[PDB]
Amino acid sequence: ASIAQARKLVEQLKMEANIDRIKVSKAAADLMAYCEAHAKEDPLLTPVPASENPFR
Template sequence: MSSKPHSANTIAHTRRMVQQLRIEAGIDRIKVSKASADLMNYCSDHARNDPLLMGIPASDNPFKDKKTCTILHVLVLFTETIDPSTARPLATDETWLHGF
């Protein structure tokens, strides 16, 4: 009595396996050399449209900052007015503020 359910499961499993093998046998296959050549040709033909290869123009890039950071701009202007040899300001007036 215990062998009947086991054989029914085996038959169902075998039928599913045969069905899957028939599906796989019906698939048209090509050689790896042809598939790789086709893939290389596709990549070459579409490379000019790939933003990872060609980059994104700054005008079209939504993630590019439109303005510079004001604090960094002030620091750059301030350091340009310092004499590197003495670490003192080049002028006594506030010339570094004239950039604003």
């Protein structure tokens, strides 16, 4: 019945709660570092000349 699926759900939270969580500041620094490594090459932000632009 619903007891079985409820038991499945609860051992799911027992299994997913024991993982290790890194600091949020470290994750933010990692995201910033990844953003600075490709910002100068992404054509969406930086303007691109029409010669290199395949859209005329």
